[PDB]
Design an enzyme around this catalytic site. Structure first.
Site, PDB file in Angstrom:
ATOM      1  N   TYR A 229       0.810  -1.206   0.000  1.00 37.06           N
ATOM      2  CA  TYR A 229       0.000   0.000   0.000  1.00 37.06           C
ATOM      3  C   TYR A 229       0.846   1.261   0.000  1.00 37.06           C
ATOM      4  O   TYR A 229       0.579   2.193  -0.757  1.00 37.06           O
ATOM      5  CB  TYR A 229      -0.976  -0.004   1.183  1.00 37.06           C
ATOM      6  N   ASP A 331      19.535  -6.169 -17.128  1.00 39.45           N
ATOM      7  CA  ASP A 331      18.480  -6.727 -17.976  1.00 39.45           C
ATOM      8  C   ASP A 331      17.303  -5.767 -18.141  1.00 39.45           C
ATOM      9  O   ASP A 331      16.216  -6.172 -18.561  1.00 39.45           O
ATOM     10  CB  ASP A 331      17.994  -8.077 -17.429  1.00 39.45           C
ATOM     11  N   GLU A 651      31.078  -9.501  19.537  1.00 42.82           N
ATOM     12  CA  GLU A 651      32.020  -9.556  18.431  1.00 42.82           C
ATOM     13  C   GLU A 651      33.327  -8.986  18.957  1.00 42.82           C
ATOM     14  O   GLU A 651      33.410  -7.793  19.243  1.00 42.82           O
ATOM     15  CB  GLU A 651      31.510  -8.724  17.260  1.00 42.82           C
ATOM     16  N   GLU A 769       3.101  12.541  42.548  1.00 38.08           N
ATOM     17  CA  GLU A 769       1.822  13.141  42.167  1.00 38.08           C
ATOM     18  C   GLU A 769       1.013  12.238  41.255  1.00 38.08           C
ATOM     19  O   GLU A 769       1.469  11.864  40.173  1.00 38.08           O
ATOM     20  CB  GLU A 769       2.037  14.497  41.500  1.00 38.08           C
ATOM     21  N   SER A 791      -1.976  18.792  46.469  1.00 39.46           N
ATOM     22  CA  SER A 791      -0.557  18.765  46.171  1.00 39.46           C
ATOM     23  C   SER A 791      -0.340  18.920  44.665  1.00 39.46           C
ATOM     24  O   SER A 791      -0.884  18.156  43.865  1.00 39.46           O
ATOM     25  CB  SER A 791       0.031  17.441  46.642  1.00 39.46           C
TER      26      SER A 791
HETATM   27 CA   LIG Z   1      16.837  -6.563 -13.205  1.00 36.20          CA
HETATM   28 CA   LIG Z   2      -1.466  16.090  43.096  1.00 34.88          CA
HETATM   29 CA   LIG Z   3      33.300  -9.558  12.150  1.00 34.26          CA
HETATM   30 CL   LIG Z   4      -7.382   1.776   1.241  1.00 33.51          CL
END
Ligand SMILES: [Ca+2]
Ligand SMILES: [Ca+2]
Ligand SMILES: [Ca+2]
Ligand SMILES: [Cl-]
Ligand SMILES: [Ca+2]
Ligand SMILES: [Ca+2]
Ligand SMILES: [Ca+2]
Ligand SMILES: [Ca+2]
Ligand SMILES: [Ca+2]
Ligand SMILES: [Ca+2]
Ligand SMILES: [Cl-]
Ligand SMILES: [Cl-]
Ligand SMILES: [Cl-]
Length: 1040
Positions: A229, A331, A651, A769, A791
């Site tokens: 979409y 292509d 790593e 609060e 408060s």
């Molecule tokens: Ca292609």
């Molecule tokens: Ca309060």
């Molecule tokens: Ca690596």
């Molecule tokens: Cl739609």
């Protein structure tokens, strides 16, 4: 204006349709298109019903009951009109063609499509499909039409498509149809309505349908859809902007600049060398004519259109990336698919030396809004497809994407120089029960259009280059569940699984690979340095597998697989047949032509009913066989843990560590501790240490505390929601992840220089609060009211209807301890009876919050609770009933306070006791009185007067006022005048105690101010004592 501005736009549009008045016919790409246009037109001209008595214009489009015939007819007419007006076409200007086109239009106006016509069956063809094609015809044929003809055709479109009222792509199409008819009908108001129609499509969203700031696109509420979409929105919007651009009705909405961002955020990362990644194309992976390379074309076209209207910087960037992709398109996928206009634009671009190819893109990107991730490294691209309780597994509607069962089951896509891997009928031949990366029940299906009951899907990243993702799989309709993690570094991907459990009675599998091969299917498969048979039919259960090398069909597409610890890997080289009909049997896309493709499939078999299965493997793209072997001998990664509690990989070249935390309890792996579900990544260097944190559940409304077991000297930088807690001896911080949407929070510590100061301890933020507390769960929505007696000047009005109604808050308890929990309640004639619970444990009894007396507020003591660790806690207030004099069950909550208790502050020091006692002189212990405290007590032996002393030094937890008590062993041989010093804050006090009395009890000596620490003492001296001096125990009790 009134003619010529419309004339100008109309000519611009027509030129988009047909390529313009003139162009280079020696351009073979243009020539091929012109021919294609001509042939197609001759086709429909030949099959056209031409006689006055006709009941339709083509047989393939009969009228009366199927409204599709409207669109089909007009598309056929459009094709003819196209050749009629195409420069270079052997049918250009053909008078008989012209006459047949126009008679067709007038026939439609008399019989099927006209102002007042019956709109039978499907609405779409009347309001969008038809007008769209009719608009295009009229654009081409305008100068050959009378005013009366143009009026009639437009009157029909105004009739079926009067205003913009719909959403998403329908709304876009409404807008295009309305805008183009306006231009053709010279109706400024109508064009403006067209322009205005797209504004509602422009803003970002944080849930539901649309584009997200993180780059996600979601449509149909729960599906990753950039390629589906979102692709068509991008197209129509880029076209509307281009047409209207510069005109009185040009797009002015500032949000239009989001459309340019969409390219960088939502499209560029998903185009790999001309392939739009299938994982964002939703149900469209089942369209044979719309495979990934074909799907990319509309986006490339949109980007070209956007460069024509973009600001300098963007236009440049856009041309560079499109050039890159076009140069790769050997292509001519793009050139053979688009209109002449775009062929011209595309070719001009690749021939322009002032535009350089963008080159390979390198970046990691987490798409938290649609449970997706992309790793782009030099040499390969990697797509990751997940789902959660927020995002559906896959979409199948209208008999489309029928075999998409496992396309969201933690599927992995590996992109390289084998550009055709996922096109060339990949989807119609592959074993869809064994999609790469997935963990599945063998040869099973899964209910479509469904979300899991697991929220843990997402991840985090570092340096914009390295990332870690995770998914708690729970197949819908199955018991099957698993924890799958991916660790994506510079040139490897580590995949880990554990917690793999099922009671479904079916062999459980994890797919390492399912690669499409060359036309022979003979790509060399080298295992543990030894070539396997390359013939189709090959099948083995290969044990003690250390590494595998599969040669790519094209240079740059080898794939390596390393199996840490060795693994039992099943393998299958086979030819597969199938047709697209299996994936898509909708009327538009049904195609039963058989295709045969070759595949190499590698996987793990966890057996039936696994209780706690696991896997680990490492993808090593683009490496030679010996390099793969070389990696296996000395791996650049180290798996720190792979369990149901956490999964972590480091790593060791990059010194980058990724960790997924699966539980909402304190958990330690490597240097890192987390008290919440989290995805975490660290980068260490000589000079600094950086940490990235995210909440993949996206449903933590409180905090995540992180410890890092290493000393830092101070701070370099930090994101907003990070609060640094400590630098040394270990790094400590917390993240406020409320409304995070799974995004990442980073902090970078310094490791060198002179140590700065550790942050001051963070006291309990009293009061909490109510009006500002994140809400974790509720049955009834509360409202904040203003009140000068409250408060913070605000109170929170519960709207609770009935018993068991609750509101659950998240409070950051910044200091571990046992606190008495209090709440300040404003008077309200509607006050129920509430029960407080913390973390599922009730605290105290229920409190009737109603009263009639004078006071406007009261402080309720709910009860006491022990908070063992600092972090977030859930305070729930549950309606349990109501006072008979109350309006109902509501409540006016002002705040909470957590007050310390004796448990935390009271200190006792015994004579032994290993810490806190320092003696002077020789004291003698015994058990002979049972006048209490401890086993024993000590005494001076009524000798060495004024020489001896016993000094009790308590460790005062909190500065404040403390009652000082003392106990001793009373008798008759005791001194009556024992001098006792109390050294406190501000000075020292002295009193005498009579120890031949009041033994066994706590005797109040005095009440003094003490500082936190050990600067206070309570000494017993022996000067001038008239008897035995006993030393036993002291006790400080905080007041109040
Ligand atoms: Ca292609
Ligand atoms: Ca309060
Ligand atoms: Ca690596
Ligand atoms: Cl739609
Ligand atoms: Ca409408
Ligand atoms: Ca092993
Ligand atoms: Ca979200
Ligand atoms: Ca209720
Ligand atoms: Ca004692
Ligand atoms: Ca003395
Ligand atoms: Cl005929
Ligand atoms: Cl026909
Ligand atoms: Cl407020």
């Amino acid at each position: 204006p009134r003619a010529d501005e419309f004339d100008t736009l109309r000519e611009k549009y027509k030129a988009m349709l047909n390529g313009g008045t003139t162009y280079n016919l020696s351009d073979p790409d243009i020539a091929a298109r012109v021919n294609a246009i001509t042939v197609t037109a001759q086709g429909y001209w030949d099959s056209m019903l031409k006689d006055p008595n006709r009941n339709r214009l083509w047989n393939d489009a009969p009228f009366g009951s199927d409204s599709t015939s409207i669109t089909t007819t007009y598309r056929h007419l459009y094709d003819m009109a196209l050749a009629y007006t195409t420069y270079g076409s052997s049918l250009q200007g053909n008078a008989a063609l012209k006459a047949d086109i126009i008679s067709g239009l007038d026939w439609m106006n008399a019989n099927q499509f006209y102002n007042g016509c019956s709109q039978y069956q499907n609405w779409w063809h009347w309001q969008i499909g038809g007008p769209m094609a009719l608009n295009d015809i009229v654009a081409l044929m305008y100068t050959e039409l009378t005013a009366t003809q143009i009026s009639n055709y437009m009157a029909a479109i105004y009739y079926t498509q009067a205003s913009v009222t719909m959403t998403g792509a329908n709304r876009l199409w409404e807008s295009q149809v309305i805008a183009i008819s306006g231009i053709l009908n010279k109706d400024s108001a109508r064009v403006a309505a067209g322009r205005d129609g797209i504004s509602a499509l422009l803003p970002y969203v944080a849930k539901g349908d649309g584009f997200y700031n993180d780059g996600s696109f979601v449509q149909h509420t729960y599906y990753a859809y950039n390629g589906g979409y979102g692709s068509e929105l991008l197209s129509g919007i880029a076209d509307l902007i281009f047409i209207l651009n510069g005109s009185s009705w040009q797009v002015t909405d500032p949000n239009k600049n989001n459309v340019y961002r969409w390219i960088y955020d939502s499209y560029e990362p998903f185009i790999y060398k001309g392939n739009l990644m299938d994982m964002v194309r939703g149900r469209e992976i089942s369209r044979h004519g719309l495979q990934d390379d074909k799907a990319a074309v509309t986006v490339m076209a949109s980007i070209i259109r956007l460069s024509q209207t973009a600001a300098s910087a963007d236009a440049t960037a856009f041309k560079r990336m499109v050039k890159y992709w076009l140069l790769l398109d050997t292509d001519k996928t793009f050139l053979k698919a688009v209109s002449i206009d775009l062929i011209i634009a595309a070719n001009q671009l690749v021939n322009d030396s002032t535009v350089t190819s963008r080159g390979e893109l390198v970046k990691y990107k987490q798409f938290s809004g649609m449970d997706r991730a992309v790793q782009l490294r030099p040499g390969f691209g990697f797509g990751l497809s997940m789902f959660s309780s927020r995002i559906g597994n896959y979409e199948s509607i209208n008999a489309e994407n029928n075999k998409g069962w496992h396309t969201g089951d933690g599927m992995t896509y590996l992109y390289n120089t084998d550009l055709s891997q996922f096109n060339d009928h990949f989807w119609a031949t592959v074993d869809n029960y064994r999609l790469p990366g997935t963990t599945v029940l063998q040869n099973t299906t899964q209910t479509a259009n469904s979300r899991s009951d697991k929220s843990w899907a997402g991840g985090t990243d570092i340096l914009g280059q390295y990332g870690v993702s995770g998914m708690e799989l729970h197949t819908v309709g199955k018991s099957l569940t698993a924890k799958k993690s991916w660790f994506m570094f510079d040139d490897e991907i580590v995949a880990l699984g554990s917690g793999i459990a099922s009671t479904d009675g079916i062999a459980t599998e994890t797919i390492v690979e399912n690669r499409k091969l060359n036309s022979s299917g003979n790509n060399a498969l080298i295992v543990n340095g030894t070539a396997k048979p390359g013939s189709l039919g090959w099948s083995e259960t290969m044990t003690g597998t250390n590494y595998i090398h599969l040669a790519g069909s094209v240079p740059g597409s080898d794939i390596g697989y390393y199996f840490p610890g060795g693994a039992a890997v099943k393998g299958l080289r086979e030819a597969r047949s199938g047709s697209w009909s299996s994936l898509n049997s909708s009327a538009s896309w049904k195609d039963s032509t058989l295709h045969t493709r070759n595949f190499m499939t590698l996987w793990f078999d966890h057996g039936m009913n696994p209780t706690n299965g696991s896997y680990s493997y490492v993808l090593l793209p683009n490496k030679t066989s010996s390099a793969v072997a070389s990696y296996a001998a000395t791996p650049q990664i180290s798996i720190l843990e792979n369990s149901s509690s956490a999964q972590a990989v480091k790593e060791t070249q990059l010194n980058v560590t990724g960790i997924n935390f699966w539980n909402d309890e304190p958990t330690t792996v490597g240097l890192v501790t987390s008290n919440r579900k989290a995805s975490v990544m660290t980068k260490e260097t000589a000079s600094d240490f950086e940490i990235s944190v995210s909440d993949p559940t996206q449903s933590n409304v409180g905090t995540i505390y992180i410890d890092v077991n290493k000393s830092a000297t101070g701070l370099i930088s930090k994101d907003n929601e990070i609060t640094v807690i400590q630098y040394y001896p270990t790094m400590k911080f917390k993240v406020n992840v409320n409304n995070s949407g799974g995004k990442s929070y980073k902090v970078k510590f310094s490791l060198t220089g002179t140590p700065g100061s550790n942050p001051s301890p963070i006291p309990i933020p009293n009061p909490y609060e109510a009006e500002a507390l994140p809400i974790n769960a509720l049955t009834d929505t509360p409202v904040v009211y203003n009140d000068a007696n409250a408060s913070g000047g605000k109170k929170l009005g519960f709207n609770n209807n009935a018993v068991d109604d609750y509101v659950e808050f998240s409070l950051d308890v910044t200091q571990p301890g046992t606190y008495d929990v209090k709440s300040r309640i404003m008077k309200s004639t509607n006050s129920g009876i509430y029960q407080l619970s913390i973390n599922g444990t009730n605290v105290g009894s229920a409190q009737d919050m109603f009263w009639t007396t004078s006071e406007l507020s009261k402080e309720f003591t709910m009860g006491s609770y022990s908070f063992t660790s600092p972090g977030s806690y859930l305070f729930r207030l549950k309606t349990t009933g109501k006072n008979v004099s109350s309006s109902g069950y509501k409540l006016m909550l002002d705040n909470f306070s957590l007050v310390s208790t004796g448990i935390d502050t009271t200190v006792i020091v015994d004579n032994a006791d290993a810490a806190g006692v320092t003696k002077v002189g020789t004291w003698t212990g015994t058990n002979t009185q049972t006048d209490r405290y401890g086993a024993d007590y000590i005494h001076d032996g009524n000798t060495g007067k004024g020489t001896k002393s016993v000094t009790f030094t308590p460790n005062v937890p909190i500065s404040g006022t403390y009652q000082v008590y003392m106990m001793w062993a009373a008798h008759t041989n005791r001194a009556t005048n024992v001098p006792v010093d109390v050294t406190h804050s501000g000075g020292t006090a002295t009193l005498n105690v009579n120890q031949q009395g009041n033994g066994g009890v706590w005797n109040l000596l005095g009440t003094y101010s003490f500082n936190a620490g050990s600067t206070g003492a309570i000494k017993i001296r022996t000067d001038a004592t008239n008897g035995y001096v006993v030393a036993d125990a002291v006790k400080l009790v905080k007041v109040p």
